[PDB]
Design a protein around this ligand. Structure first.
Ligand SMILES: CCOc1ccnc(CCNC(=S)Nc2ccc(C)cn2)c1F
Lengths: 399, 517
């Protein structure tokens, strides 16, 4: 076993376990009991004061429960280890695979075990709770894929040469398999991969392929109206003015003249010649993303989501305010289910594109998210997230 | 017998070296008797002067003899943290009913459990000799940081077995007590209780005999528990004409506790008495409404009400009612009107809100509470109609989700009092506000304000506009703040200004509000 260690000075996570439903608890008890019998994990004494929250989640189209451990805190404190194929995104179709189970064949550093302590909670506190710690590389821990890389490299050696036409990327417990073959000749190459891996892995995301060339970006778009009322224009100026921040070439001087004096909101205004040309020019400037926005690896990726209504959502991934790296839409469930699907989708994208998860800003009350997010979550990683209250104006300027 | 838990001192630190303070000869005598005794029972052991560690001891006096009290403050400060013992207690509504119930006191618990051999050296203490010219512990010492944790951890393994051969019996450990409940018939039950005691005994653990045990019903954390029902212990509402801030606070306190079962308890009036109070001992005269409240609480409190237990076979049903502005009451039952537990939610999240948000939030609070006690969410009965909810839902920017729920026609029904137009109104006057306004129809007003705040000035504008405008009115504002607040369609606020606006808003037939930079 490799002697993993925490970042200098840091101690182990002592993270509070969010309460669970009798339903998830049961699953987690069945699962863990099985993991115990196979020595994957072990019961622990009161001399271990660490703790990582655990959750049970449903495997999409599988009927079986999955144990999802939230090692976000541990990971942040796990020493760094000392690459991303910009080609993967270029591929036409990519299938994600859950190679998490590989880890179970590698013992974990004996002195690091205690930090992976986690707890299966109980109803109404009728009993202290089952406490356990990992003996092997645990799924979801930043350390596993690293300590297993070498072995994972060797095991991918053949397929890698037998099919240098498909790119294979690994991120945590997931394998990202990209290709340009045909959806039929592709699913076959993925399967051969599966059979291969079985030699020494469920599909994730519907078993389905993402299709990563179409990841479209999204412009700011101005209304296209027949007649323009004072209101319309006002709103138009407002939006433009905002976008004025990013794209400096935007002008409103000519539109604003149509709004001189205090007219009635519904009064239809004919746009002068000057104005009409200013609009169209503004329109041209908006058809493409502001130039000069580059991804900086040394900076965090932030994803911010807004609720639009009717099952429609908008998001923006950036590193510096206004400097957007990507923007999109997501449409239908129920508010939460959707937001969790959107999150999982935007994450996957970030992973495929920049090889890392973004920090989310979610428009929802913490207590509510904590309550149902695990009901629809299916990914094996867990992004970091904070909770917010989006302004009526920001949303009023997207989609 | 029972396995040892590895203990260690915090990183970098070393055992305690605290000099033993002066002990009278009479005490010095009392200890040597006590300790010499504990050396015979294996609990402690004389050591060689190689051990530079020491923790001060002192004797305390309900007979003529004394008892040894070891001060472990230092050791504790130097000893590693442990997995903290359970902080929370099971709420009765989360228990099932039971035929027999017994509580077993576990004497000298910590005294029967081994202490990590490598750690004992640190528990060294000294007993001064009176002659003018040292031990360590071999078990869990009283007053040591890690004893409540290791003791529990032990008893659990100790119980694990007897727990598997008796899946029908239910055991709950709380400190040094062992509450056991079952559905065996009286005889069999007491007999099992007897086996338990042996099992606990085989590990030197000793308990009280049937005659000296505690049996239902019994208090416990301010509750009054029976094998078939539960409630709260007798709450006495003082009778007097001179109340101090303290009394009022304590009462309010007692009143709150009671509402987890007594529905209808009210404290609004009592609690207004505390406004601007200058001293805990200040006497506040009871106003008429406070007196009316007190008396009403007295009534409710005179004839007790119990809660029934949880029957996992049936569903959990939750019903909520609006008992005043910002006040909600709820009850969770399984059999119609046979309460497991009730409660009231008064929490306001944010300075402004409407009944739809509050309700929803109370729902979330209730859902959370239920998952913790029963491990499932109840099916809700809400005084709100599907459409009303849905209408506010989509129009709100935040996301939320209410589990299974069904409209219950039980006034008052929650509704939205007004809805901002989705588009400007034709023929409705247009007001441009900035403290004053200007309309398209030429009218205008400007007022001066003393004692204000930029953003309050903003709401003021809008206010004026609403006042002087007709039944329909368009309003254009520069304030994104004012926009924000009104957009959220609040029906209740901390501020009176927002509250006046809301009133105005309710009277209109159509209001359109826009923002411009
Ligand atoms: C004083 C309450 O004691 C207990 C607290 C927590 N758990 C238990 C064991 C399980 N008991 C159950 S599920 N039911 C139950 C019913 C009535 C009474 C008076 C005590 N316990 C207890 F007996």
């Amino acid at each position: 076993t490799v002697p993993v260690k925490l970042k200098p000075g840091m101690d182990g996570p002592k993270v509070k376990q969010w309460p669970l439903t009798e339903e998830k608890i049961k699953a987690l008890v069945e699962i863990c009991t099985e993991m115990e019998k196979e020595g994957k994990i072990s019961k622990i004494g009161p001399e271990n004061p660490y703790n990582t929250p655990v959750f049970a989640i449903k495997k999409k189209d599988s009927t079986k429960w999955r144990k999802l451990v939230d090692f976000r805190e541990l990971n942040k404190r796990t020493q760094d280890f000392w690459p991303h194929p910009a080609g993967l995104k270029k591929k036409k179709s990519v299938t994600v695979l859950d190679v998490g189970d590989a880890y179970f064949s590698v013992p974990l550093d004996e002195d690091f075990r205690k930090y992976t302590a986690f707890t299966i909670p109980s109803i109404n506190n009728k009993t202290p709770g089952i406490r356990y710690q990992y003996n092997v590389l645990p799924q979801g821990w930043k350390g596993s894929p690293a300590i297993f890389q070498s072995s994972m490299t060797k095991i991918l050696e053949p397929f890698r040469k037998q099919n240098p036409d498909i790119v294979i990327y690994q991120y945590m417990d997931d394998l990202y398999v990209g290709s340009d073959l045909e959806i039929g000749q592709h699913r076959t190459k993925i399967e051969e991969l599966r059979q291969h891996l079985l030699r020494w892995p469920p599909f994730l995301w519907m078993g389905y392929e993402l299709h990563p060339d179409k990841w479209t970006v999204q412009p700011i778009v101005l209304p296209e109206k027949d007649s323009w009322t004072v209101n319309d224009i006002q709103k138009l100026v407002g939006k433009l003015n905002w976008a004025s921040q990013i794209y400096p070439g935007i002008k409103v001087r000519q539109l604003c003249k149509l709004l001189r004096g205090t007219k009635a909101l519904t009064e239809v205004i004919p746009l002068t010649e000057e104005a009409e040309l200013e609009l169209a020019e503004n329109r041209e400037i908006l058809k493409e993303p502001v130039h000069g926005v580059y991804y900086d690896p040394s900076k965090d990726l932030i994803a911010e989501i807004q609720k639009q209504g009717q099952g429609q959502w908008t998001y923006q991934i950036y590193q510096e305010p206004f400097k957007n790296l990507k923007t999109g839409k997501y449409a239908r469930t129920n508010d939460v289910k959707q937001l969790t699907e959107a999150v999982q989708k935007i994450t996957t994208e970030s992973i495929v594109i920049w090889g890392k998860t973004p920090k989310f800003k979610l428009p929802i009350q913490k207590e509510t998210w904590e309550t149902w997010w695990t009901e629809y979550w299916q990914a094996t990683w867990i992004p970091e997230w904070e909770f917010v209250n989006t302004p009526p104006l920001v949303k009023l300027w997207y989609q | 017998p029972i396995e040892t838990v590895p203990v260690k001192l915090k990183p970098g630190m070393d055992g305690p070296k605290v000099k033993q303070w002066p002990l009278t000869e009479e005490k010095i005598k009392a200890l040597v008797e006590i300790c010499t005794e504990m050396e015979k029972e294996g609990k402690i052991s004389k050591i060689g002067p190689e051990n530079p560690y020491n923790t001060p001891v002192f004797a305390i006096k309900d007979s003529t003899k004394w008892r040894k009290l070891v001060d472990f403050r230092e050791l504790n400060k130097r000893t590693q943290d442990f997995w903290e013992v359970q902080l929370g207690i099971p709420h009765p509504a989360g228990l099932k009913k039971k035929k027999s119930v017994t509580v077993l006191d576990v004497g000298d618990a910590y005294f029967s459990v081994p202490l990590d051999e490598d750690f004992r050296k640190y528990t060294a203490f000294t007993i001064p000799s009176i002659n003018n010219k040292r031990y360590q512990y071999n078990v869990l010492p009283q007053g040591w940081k890690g004893s409540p944790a290791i003791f529990q951890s032990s008893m659990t393994k100790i119980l694990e077995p007897f727990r598997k051969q008796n899946p029908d019996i239910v055991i709950y450990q709380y400190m040094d007590d062992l509450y056991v409940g079952s559905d065996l018939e009286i005889g069999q039950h007491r007999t099992k209780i007897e086996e338990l005691r042996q099992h606990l005994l085989r590990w030197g653990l000793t308990t009280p005999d049937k005659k000296h045990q505690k049996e239902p019903p019994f208090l416990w954390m301010g509750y009054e528990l029976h094998p078939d029902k539960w409630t709260v212990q007798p709450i006495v509402l003082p009778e007097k004409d001179s109340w101090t801030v303290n009394d009022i606070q304590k009462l309010v306190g007692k009143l709150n506790w009671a509402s987890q079962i007594y529905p209808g308890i009210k404290v609004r009036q009592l609690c207004k008495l505390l406004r601007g109070t200058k001293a805990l001992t200040e006497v506040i005269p009871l106003t008429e409404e406070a007196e009316l409240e007190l008396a009403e609480n007295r009534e409710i409190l005179k004839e007790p009400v119990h809660g029934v237990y949880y029957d996992p076979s049936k569903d959990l049903i939750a019903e909520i009612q609006k008992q005043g502005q910002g006040q909600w009451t709820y009850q969770i039952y399984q059999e119609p009107f046979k309460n497991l537990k009730t409660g009231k939610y008064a929490r306001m999240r944010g300075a402004h809100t409407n009944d739809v948000k509050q309700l929803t939030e109370a729902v979330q609070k209730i859902t959370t509470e239920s998952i913790v006690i029963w491990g499932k969410t109840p099916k809700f009965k809400l005084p709100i109609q599907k459409e009303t909810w849905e209408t506010w839902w989509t129009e709100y920017w935040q996301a939320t989700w209410i589990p299974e729920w069904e409209f219950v026609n039980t006034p008052p029904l929650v509704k939205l009092w007004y809805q901002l137009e989705k588009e400007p109104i034709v023929g409705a006057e247009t007001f441009y506000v900035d403290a004053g306004y200007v309309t398209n129809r030429g009218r205008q007003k400007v007022v001066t304000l003393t004692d204000t705040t930029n953003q309050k000035t903003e709401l003021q504008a809008i206010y004026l506009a609403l006042q002087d405008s007709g039944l329909e009115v368009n309003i254009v504002t520069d304030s994104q703040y004012a926009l924000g607040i009104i957009q959220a369609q609040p029906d209740q606020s901390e501020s009176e200004l927002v509250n006046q606006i809301i009133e105005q808003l309710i009277k209109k037939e159509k209001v359109y509000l826009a923002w411009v930079p």
